[PDB]
Design a binder for this molecule. Sequence first.
Ligand code: BCL
Ligand code: BCL
Ligand code: BCL
Ligand SMILES: CC[C@H]1c2cc3[nH]c4c(c3C)C(=O)[C@H](C(=O)OC)c4c3nc(cc4[nH]c(cc(n2)[C@@H]1C)c(C(C)=O)c4C)[C@@H](C)[C@@H]3CCC(=O)OC/C=C(\C)CCC[C@H](C)CCC[C@H](C)CCCC(C)C
Ligand SMILES: CC[C@H]1c2cc3[nH]c4c(c3C)C(=O)[C@H](C(=O)OC)c4c3nc(cc4[nH]c(cc(n2)[C@@H]1C)c(C(C)=O)c4C)[C@@H](C)[C@@H]3CCC(=O)OC/C=C(\C)CCC[C@H](C)CCC[C@H](C)CCCC(C)C
Ligand SMILES: CCCCCCCCCCCCCCCC(=O)OC[C@H](COP(=O)(O)OCCN)OC(=O)CCCCCCC[C@H](Br)[C@@H](Br)CCCCCCCC
Ligand SMILES: CCCCCCCCCCCC[N+](C)(C)[O-]
Ligand SMILES: CCCCCCCCCCCC[N+](C)(C)[O-]
Ligand SMILES: CCCCCCCCCCCC[N+](C)(C)[O-]
Ligand SMILES: CCCCCCCCCCCC[N+](C)(C)[O-]
Ligand SMILES: CCCCCCCCCCCC[N+](C)(C)[O-]
Ligand SMILES: [Cl-]
Ligand SMILES: [Cl-]
Ligand SMILES: [Cl-]
Ligand SMILES: [Fe+3]
Ligand SMILES: [K+]
Lengths: 302, 243, 281
Amino acid sequence: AEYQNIFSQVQVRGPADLGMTEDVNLANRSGVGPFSTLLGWFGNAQLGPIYLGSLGVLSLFSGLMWFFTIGIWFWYQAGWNPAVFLRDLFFFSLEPPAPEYGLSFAAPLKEGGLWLIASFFMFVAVWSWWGRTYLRAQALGMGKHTAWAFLSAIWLWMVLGFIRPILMGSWSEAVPYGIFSHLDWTNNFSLVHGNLFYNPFHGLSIAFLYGSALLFAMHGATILAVSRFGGERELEQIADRGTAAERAALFWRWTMGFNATMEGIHRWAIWMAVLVTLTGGIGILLSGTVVDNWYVWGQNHG
Amino acid sequence: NFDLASLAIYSFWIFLAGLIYYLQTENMREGYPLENEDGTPAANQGPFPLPKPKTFILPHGRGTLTVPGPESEDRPIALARTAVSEGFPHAPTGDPMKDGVGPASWVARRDLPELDGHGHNKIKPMKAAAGFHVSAGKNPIGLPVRGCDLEIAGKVVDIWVDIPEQMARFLEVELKDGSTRLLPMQMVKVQSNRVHVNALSSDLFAGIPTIKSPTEVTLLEEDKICGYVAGGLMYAAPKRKSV
Amino acid sequence: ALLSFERKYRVPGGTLVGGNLFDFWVGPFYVGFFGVATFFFAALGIILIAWSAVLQGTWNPQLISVYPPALEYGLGGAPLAKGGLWQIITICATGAFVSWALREVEICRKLGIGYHIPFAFAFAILAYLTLVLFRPVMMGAWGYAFPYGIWTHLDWVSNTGYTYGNFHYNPAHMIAISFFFTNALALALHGALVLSAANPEKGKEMRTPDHEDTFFRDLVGYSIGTLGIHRLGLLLSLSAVFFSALCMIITGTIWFDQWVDWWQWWVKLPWWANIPGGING
Ligand code: BCL
Ligand code: BCL
Ligand code: BCL
Ligand SMILES: CC[C@H]1c2cc3[nH]c4c(c3C)C(=O)[C@H](C(=O)OC)c4c3nc(cc4[nH]c(cc(n2)[C@@H]1C)c(C(C)=O)c4C)[C@@H](C)[C@@H]3CCC(=O)OC/C=C(\C)CCC[C@H](C)CCC[C@H](C)CCCC(C)C
Ligand SMILES: CC[C@H]1c2cc3[nH]c4c(c3C)C(=O)[C@H](C(=O)OC)c4c3nc(cc4[nH]c(cc(n2)[C@@H]1C)c(C(C)=O)c4C)[C@@H](C)[C@@H]3CCC(=O)OC/C=C(\C)CCC[C@H](C)CCC[C@H](C)CCCC(C)C
Ligand SMILES: CCCCCCCCCCCCCCCC(=O)OC[C@H](COP(=O)(O)OCCN)OC(=O)CCCCCCC[C@H](Br)[C@@H](Br)CCCCCCCC
Ligand SMILES: CCCCCCCCCCCC[N+](C)(C)[O-]
Ligand SMILES: CCCCCCCCCCCC[N+](C)(C)[O-]
Ligand SMILES: CCCCCCCCCCCC[N+](C)(C)[O-]
Ligand SMILES: CCCCCCCCCCCC[N+](C)(C)[O-]
Ligand SMILES: CCCCCCCCCCCC[N+](C)(C)[O-]
Ligand SMILES: [Cl-]
Ligand SMILES: [Cl-]
Ligand SMILES: [Cl-]
Ligand SMILES: [Fe+3]
Ligand SMILES: [K+]
């Protein structure tokens, strides 16, 4: 058969790639980790090095303290028996404080307090990590597109767990930490707001989520299809268009009548994705603050 | 819009229309303005205008690229109209594999090698690439190369590797006369006892474009080689036996 | 009209059917035999929908809805007004989609590229064919397929899901969702990385793929590389859809009770089954 290039036929290895320096404070990069032949059939075999400054130490520590806080709660929910822990692992839930404690921190640890602690830790972890995304870009002289893109994800998370509960006047409106419980929450949220299929922002979010799958299938299939002309080498194709970029454009022009550039496909990409959680977080932020029932809103607003 | 949701959704649609507009103009930095088949500026360019140019500063002293700008093939195109009106194909006027047309097409990219983050040639033969070796999979160096006419076209004498990405990019193949050619790795099939190249018959190998220096390739040369081998799928088909 | 670089590629050849008969373009669009097949199937498809509107008595695009054969018709045919149209429009739909994949294969042939795109598309067609064709056939009626309407199909999604309780608990649907969200993560990041290299801080030189690896290693300790990431997006997104097909092909067929209750297999496993404590004892 013709070779498809989803996995590689031959792996090559050379000296560990320690990276570009630019302005990065090299005191804080680890050494390279192992090489994995398995990853190697699909992507790069090399693992590491990683950069861990102070902001990264904070983020990880805080992140771990979150997982832990939940874990403590779970093992406790499991009466300290590991059999029960493993058995019920998807049924355990760390729930927020009752409606009765509003936005206060007055609630007992076993009945709201731990949830606040966990949320505190997750807040510090994510935000510190956000700053990492900016600073690692900066040290290398690169654009801040990643940190901006990540902000759109942060937005939906921030709306669900912090902004919306603040605007609704209680932490009881926030999502519990639990595998089954957070799915139940999601279902319940829609039931209680007149079915989220009626929320125009929900519909957009889906358009974009599905569209991201459409787009990345298109894009990735396209780069692979032109990988015999060096397609994946997108920066140099940006700087000096080659037959790879041209055949790619023309595939699409001849299929659907218009097409992209090598740099431009990546702007369609970043936005297709980012609009998922943007529109998404609007949808939710408005739910119960401005609109109690999307079926009802729909009847009065086209 | 008495209500904030209505204001929100209406504002978002306006934004999305502006975003799509902006996105589409960003994607007109190459290949535009549209042209008639004779190469002149076409009459209807569409409702989107050309963006205001941007300039990229290329690294390693290699200049800048400003797009959009004066578009030009910078090579002659051996094809001729086959109809008296727009929209039909253009017959090659000679041998399209040699002429570089159709699926054998190449672009007049820079005739320098792609450089890496440190300004070193990106691709080099593995002999010249310190500490690089095959780490997994069947090593092709030494295998006979077979074209789609089921005839031996040569032997594999090296892998050309991308240093920074640590991957195989070409196989260097020695022909009957002792010269070598690069074959894209994406167009070969490393089998246990041979390398098989479906795109080309053995007689077409000599015709693969050569590289001016035996231990680097330039972007222009990459394009001609890759163009040529891909062209074989169409143009070598009368010599492609079943399989 | 033509892109500045396009003429060199507009050579004869690559068609799968009809030799040179349809080897030509209208504007930017390649036609070919499957271009003709596609137009024919789409056109008839739309005319029937446009008619089906008439018989519903509406023209509003947010009202128009073509409903499948009522569940009592089984896997037989129904009159045009009462199901027949949907059956014929599904045939036209499949015809148009499959014809579009085969046109795509033709463009690939003419352009000398790999067949990855139409292959990718084939996964979308299969998802569709699960919903309108494989699932209904395994269940015994066209009534189980979704109807063609902007809102009515959403009505169908919700009714279908709530038949099995909270649909979230379908485990193939959990995997499917994970691939969708991870794909969107991957697309954000990939878009963002390439652009951050192509468009570096003010006054500086374009960065290099080595900057892109370095950025990700510094951040998460790993870089998949640029061949990798395109392999990845294709895999994530195709996987999202494969699990979407799977999660439905099983629902109504191997599993038809409440999905939440499926997870009882794990809970009730014999070693920890009867240990007291926890949520489940
Ligand atoms: C996949 C699981 C369910 C389903 C679940 C949902 C849910 C849930 C939602 C949608 C939504 C949409 N769905 Mg649906 N949808 C299904 C199957 C389909 C099929 C199909 C033939 O299989 C089609 C064509 C559509 C089309 C659509 C759009 C009307 C709308 C936006 C989707 C989008 O952007 O996707 C990604 C694609 C792109 C960004 C590319 C462009 C696609 C365009 C917009 C499709 C236009 C369709 C047009 C209105 C009908 C044309 C028919 C003509 C006769 C040719 N759906 C199945 C039955 N769909 C959303 C909505 O808001 O509905 C009101 C929404 O919330
Ligand atoms: C019965 C259930 C309701 C319903 C209830 C809800 C609710 C409630 C919500 C959604 C939301 C969404 N739903 Mg809905 N939804 C339904 C039906 C559907 C259907 C369908 C076919 O029926 C589809 C396709 C969707 C699709 C979607 C998405 C478009 C959207 C979530 C986007 C996203 O990426 O979130 C995922 C992305 C995030 C959550 C971002 C999180 C980022 C943070 C910063 C990450 C931190 C990670 C942390 C550090 C731990 C990680 C550890 C590391 C791995 C080491 N829904 C039905 C009608 N849906 C959300 C939305 O936007 O609505 C408008 C939402 O809030
Ligand atoms: C109350 C509703 C239930 C529910 C019930 C269901 C049901 C029921 C289904 C899903 C399905 C899905 N759901 Mg669920 N689901 C719920 C909650 C969610 C949530 C959430 C955050 O809560 C999410 C993220 C999802 C996510 C998903 C996806 C895994 C999957 C949909 C994508 C898909 O199938 O694409 C597949 C893509 C297609 C079918 C696209 C086909 C496009 C074709 C090939 C081309 C058409 C071209 C067009 C006509 C041309 C137009 C003209 C041009 C534009 C010019 N669900 C709630 C709990 N979900 C669906 C699924 O898996 O289906 C297989 C499904 O049937
Ligand atoms: C914009 C829409 C999409 C999106 C975008 C997006 N997400 C992003 C970004 C962007 C642009 C990032 O830059 C950022 C990132 O870093 O990606 C690599 C991120 C990110 N998105 C993430 C997740 C995520 N995104 C999601 C969604 C989405 N993200 C959307 C679909 C989702 C969901 C729910 O669908 C999830 C779960 C993270 C991978 C990453 C943010 C990381 C973060 O904030 O971490 C804080 C928490 C920790 C640091 C603790 C982690 C602990 C580790 C397991 C390490 C263990 C510790 C140590 C190794 C030693 C001890 C271990 C033991 C062995 C003892
Ligand atoms: C497999 C992974 C993802 C994927 C991939 C994918 N889709 C693709 C491709 C690929 C690789 C293409 O090459 C092809 C393309 O050309 O894209 C621009 C395509 C395509 N994916 C499309 C849409 C699409 N993909 C989707 C999903 C996905 N596609 C996945 C998430 C979805 C949804 C709902 O999520 C939609 C809506 C089209 C843009 C395009 C296919 C165009 C095509 O087939 O055109 C020929 C047909 C017509 C022009 C019209 C046909 C008219 C019918 C006869 C009548 C309509 C009947 C229909 C069932 C009614 C629906 C009513 C709705 C309210 C439900
Ligand atoms: C949630 C997102 C998480 C991403 C980050 C995961 C956290 C991983 C943390 C790993 C801990 C790192 C240990 C390093 C500290 C140490 O003691 O070893 C250092 C030592 C050298 O120190 P030296 O003194 O020489 O250097 C200083 C001057 N240059 O190096 C080593 O021995 C080990 C290096 C190990 C690096 C490997 C990291 C791999 C990460 Br986890 C990859 Br495999 C996984 C992430 C996948 C992608 C996740 C995101 C996907 C969306
Ligand atoms: C109000 C919280 C907002 C963010 C949503 C957090 C819920 C997702 C947690 C999923 C389950 C994690 N856990 C603890 C079970 O492992
Ligand atoms: C959501 C549906 C969007 C469909 C997009 C169709 C755009 C194709 C435009 C092709 C351009 C053809 N022409 C003659 C105007 O140049
Ligand atoms: C899939 C194609 C979507 C193209 C987006 C174009 C949106 C047009 C919105 C214009 C604003 C309309 N309105 C009434 C809200 O003002
Ligand atoms: C017939 C539906 C076609 C859908 C394509 C949508 C095109 C959006 C054009 C943006 C309009 C430009 N504007 C007015 C925002 O500046
Ligand atoms: C998500 C909706 C897809 C975007 C469709 C809008 C783009 C239409 C582009 C047609 C312009 C082509 N043209 C004339 C510049 O060659
Ligand atoms: Cl750090
Ligand atoms: Cl942008
Ligand atoms: Cl060098
Ligand atoms: Fe890319
Ligand atoms: K070596």
